[model samples]
Target: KIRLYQFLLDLLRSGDMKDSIWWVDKDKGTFQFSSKHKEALAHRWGIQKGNRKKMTYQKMARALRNYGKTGEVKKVKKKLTYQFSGEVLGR
Candidate 1:
């Protein structure tokens, strides 16, 4: 878990997961990302670029939450899904 938190801290310090072009809508309980942001996140996850259509908000949120909790994010082969309680207004 220490390693995980280290990774999260690194990602945060690098500003890769900061005010990017994505957000969570609390009222609607959903994650949202722009096409460009999606591409960026895919790249961060070491997935193929230009594969935004295959990305899921839940996966993104899970990765984010994991990063928040354990500071580690993993590249998965399946779609990611989840619910959030806040809104991400901008990048």
Candidate 2:
């Protein structure tokens, strides 16, 4: 888990942080990455798992959501009213 946050942190700054992952709530250590680049992020993860052919984004997203339960890092949820489209490893 510790390594996971650092891995993603390596991917992130600036006044215009849109289209990139960032802490929408910095003080609370909250996070929200761009949906637009989900595929790209997942691609990197996929390659990291090259040693194992049995890897998928679904598992990544699943882990992410589950991690949020630990109260260590909160996963950003869809804000629209009843418009949730669950978070996940994309692409």
Candidate 3:
């Protein structure tokens, strides 16, 4: 989905702009951000820490919505662990 990819790119870029949280780990080929961002992302996707392990396209859409609601993000300690699938895009 072009719109989904664009949404992901926008979310990642927004995180990259915030110096306090976003960091690209070239070694892992993964873009890392603060836990707060993860939480917001998880919330956006309507996938909680537990549900993240079973993420679906619908959930991913929820995450895009969350990102849309919250622009830039930072770190926060909540009782939640967001999951990363590394397959939201097809590159």
Candidate 4:
């Protein structure tokens, strides 16, 4: 979960991948997905999980939420259709 939290921040926040995802609030680590990369993002997470077909966004978000609940990973939020977060840019 810590690794996943870190991977998201690094992938979405570090790059100029605005079309991929964006920051809603950097100081607070809030962010959301932008456009056109759903399959790719899911694929990445699938690879991380060691099985593409076995993964789902709910499962992924649940992992993130779990980490946040434990306070080691930053929080992530989803409202209708956006996802946001902060502070995970290194492996």
Candidate 5:
């Protein structure tokens, strides 16, 4: 049961998901999901979550919104962009 942020970090390193590329800015501790493959990415998230085939992009997006409450990742002004916390960046 990994958190979304951790899942994203793993995905970034592995590059196993070929639907889209994770655009990162290390200096800014930020990453953006490509607009082209939003649904595919969301479906991948569902698969990771115990093969939940019905997971919709809207549901995954809601999860991200709530994830912001934890302060580990926050939404940036840009579309589909999120910034990592300072502590996360350090490690």
Candidate 6:
């Protein structure tokens, strides 16, 4: 059961920037997904969560929104950008 927060932290550490799926600015404590590769990222997330073949960005985005409700992550108004919370930074 990989949590969304954990999956995103992994991205900041090793996710490929050149692939354009996502970009992480650890120094700024922010990350955003590429509009061009949004579905691709969702697909990867699905596979990572145990072959959920029906997964889509809408479902994934919904999960992220829920995380914000609990203070796990916060969405920025700039497209797909999200900021890491202090609790996450401490990890």
Off by over 4 Å in 2: 13-20, 49-51, 54-57, 79-91
What's each prediction's clash count?
Answer: 8, 0, 4, 5, 0, 0
> Candidate 4's residue-wise lDDT over 16-91, tens digit each?
4556556676665566654456445756777876863766566766676676555545544455132433333222
lDDT of candidate 3 over 8-89, digit per residue (tens): 4456557643532243542332444444444455344434234436555446545544643343222123322122233433
> TM-score for all predictions?
0.29, 0.54, 0.30, 0.61, 0.80, 0.83
| Candidate 5 or 4, higher TM-score | 5
Question: In candidate 5, which residue ranges exceed 4 Å CA deviation?
Answer: 51-53
RMSDs, each prediction?
A: 10.2, 8.2, 11.5, 4.3, 2.0, 2.0
Question: Best by TM-score, which number?
Answer: 6
Candidate 4 lDDT: 0.58
lDDT of 5 by residue, 10-42 (tens): 777688664554746867778778677777777
State candidate 5's TM-score.
Answer: 0.80
**Residue 81 lDDT (model 4):** 38
Residue 72 lDDT in candidate 5: 76
Q: Name every residue pair that clashes in candidate 4.
A: 29-85, 31-83, 31-84, 31-85, 32-83
Please identify which of the two predictions, 1 or 4, would achieve the higher TM-score against the true structure.
Answer: 4
Which residues of candidate 4, in runs, are more than 4 Å off? 52-54, 73-91
Deviation from truth (RMSD, Å), model 4? 4.3
The global C-alpha lDDT for each of the candidates, from Candidate 1 onward, is 0.41, 0.48, 0.41, 0.58, 0.75, 0.77
RMSD of 2: 8.2
Per-residue CA lDDT of model 6 for 1-91, tens digit only, reads 9788878777667865435445467676788877887777777788888864667888888999998877878888888888878888788
Maximum-lDDT candidate: 6
